[PDB]
C-alpha cells in the first residue's frame, strides 16, 4: 500500500476491506449542512508538559513521537469523554498548493493537513485503544500558504536528516502549542484512521481556522522520499486520501 497508481487509495480495499465501511475518513465538510450543536463543550488542550522524543520517515509520512506513559500532553472536553493522550503528530501534503489536505471544506482543498493523534487512557495503551469505537481522537488542522510559521521551523530544519524511509532522529523539547491556530472552533464527526488498517475508532475534530505556512516551509516537505536509501527516488508528495462517503453520519459544529 502506498499513494501510487498501482498501490494507491483506490486499491486499499483488497487488503483492508474496511476501506468501504460505514465510518471512513476523511470527508468533505458541507458547512451549510453541518449542525450547530449547543451542547458541545469547548476543547481542552493541555500540552504545556509535552515531551517529544523523535521524528521518523515511515515511508508514507513523517511522525513526531511523544512520550505517552503519563498524562503530559492531553486533549479533553469538546465531544470527548475522558482523557486522550498525545502519542504522535504527522502531516499530509500535495505536489502543489492546490491540494494536500484530506478533509475538505465545501469542497475546498488546502495545501496540507496536520493530524495530532491521541488515545483514550481508559484503554491503557494505543494498541487496545484502536479496538474501540471511542478509542482515538484526532485533532486536524489545515495549512494554507502565506506567512511563515515560526513554530514549524524546528520541524522543517530536521527533514534533511530523515529524507528516506526508515530514518529517524532524536527530537526533544518540541512544543506543539506552536502549531495551534488562534481559535479552537471545530467540526466533529465519527470516523477512521486515514491509513490502513483504517480502523473505525476515531472521533475527528477539525479546526475551522487554518494556520499559515510559507511556501519555502511547505517546499521542504516536498523533498522527502517514499523510498528507502539506495532505491530509485520517489518524492513524498500527495500522501493524502480522497474524501469518502458520509453515509448517514452527521457533522456537528461548535459554532
Ligand atoms: Zn493523517
Swiss-Prot record:
Optimum pH is 6-8. Changing residue 58 to L: Reduced activity. Changing residue 88 to P: In OPTB3; in Czechoslovakia. Changing residue 117 to K/R: Strongly reduced CO(2) hydrase and p-nitrophenyl acetate esterase activities. It is found in: Cytoplasm; Cell membrane. The keyword Transmembrane helix does not apply. SMART domains: Carb_anhydrase. Keywords: Acetylation, Cell membrane, Cytoplasm, Disease variant, Lyase, Membrane, Metal-binding, Osteopetrosis, Phosphoprotein, Zinc. Activated by X-ray, histamine, L-adrenaline, L- and D-phenylalanine, L- and D-histidine, L-His-OMe and beta-Ala-His (carnosine). The record marks 3, 58, 63 as: Fine-tunes the proton-transfer properties of H-64. The modification Phosphoserine is found at residues 161, 168. PROSITE patterns: ALPHA_CA_1, ALPHA_CA_2. Target of drugs used in treatments against glaucoma disorder and breast cancer. This is Carbonic anhydrase 2. It comes from Homo sapiens. The gene is CA2.
Amino acid at each position: 500500500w502506498g499513494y501510487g497508481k498501482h498501490n494507491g487509495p483506490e486499491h486499499w480495499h483488497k487488503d483492508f476491506p474496511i476501506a468501504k465501511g460505514e465510518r471512513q475518513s476523511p470527508v468533505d465538510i458541507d458547512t451549510h449542512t453541518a449542525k450547530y450543536d449547543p451542547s458541545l463543550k469547548p476543547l481542552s488542550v493541555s500540552y504545556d508538559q509535552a515531551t517529544s522524543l523523535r521524528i521518523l520517515n515511515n515511508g508514507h509520512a513523517f511522525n513526531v513521537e511523544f512520550d505517552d506513559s503519563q498524562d503530559k500532553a492531553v486533549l479533553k472536553g469538546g465531544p470527548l469523554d475522558g482523557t486522550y493522550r498525545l502519542i504522535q503528530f504527522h502531516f499530509h501534503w500535495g505536489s502543489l498548493d492546490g491540494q494536500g489536505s484530506e478533509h475538505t471544506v465545501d469542497k475546498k482543498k488546502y495545501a496540507a493537513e496536520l493530524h495530532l493523534v491521541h488515545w483514550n487512557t481508559k484503554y491503557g495503551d494505543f494498541g487496545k485503544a484502536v479496538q474501540q469505537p471511542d478509542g482515538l481522537a484526532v485533532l486536524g488542522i489545515f495549512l494554507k500558504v502565506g506567512s511563515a510559521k515560526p513554530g514549524l521551523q524546528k520541524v522543517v530544519d530536521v527533514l534533511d536528516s530523515i529524507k528516506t524511509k526508515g530514518k529517524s532522529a532524536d527530537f526533544t523539547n518540541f512544543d506543539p502549542r506552536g502549531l495551534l491556530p488562534e481559535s479552537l472552533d471545530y467540526w466533529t464527526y465519527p470516523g477512521s484512521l486515514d491509513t490502513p488498517p483504517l480502523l473505525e475508532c476515531v472521533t475527528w475534530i477539525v479546526l475551522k481556522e487554518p494556520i499559515s505556512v510559507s511556501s519555502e516551509q511547505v517546499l521542504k516537505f516536498r523533498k522527502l522520499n517514499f523510498n528507502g536509501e539506495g532505491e530509485p527516488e520517489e518524492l513524498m508528495v500527495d500522501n493524502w486520501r480522497p474524501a469518502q462517503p458520509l453515509k448517514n453520519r452527521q457533522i456537528k459544529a461548535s459554532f
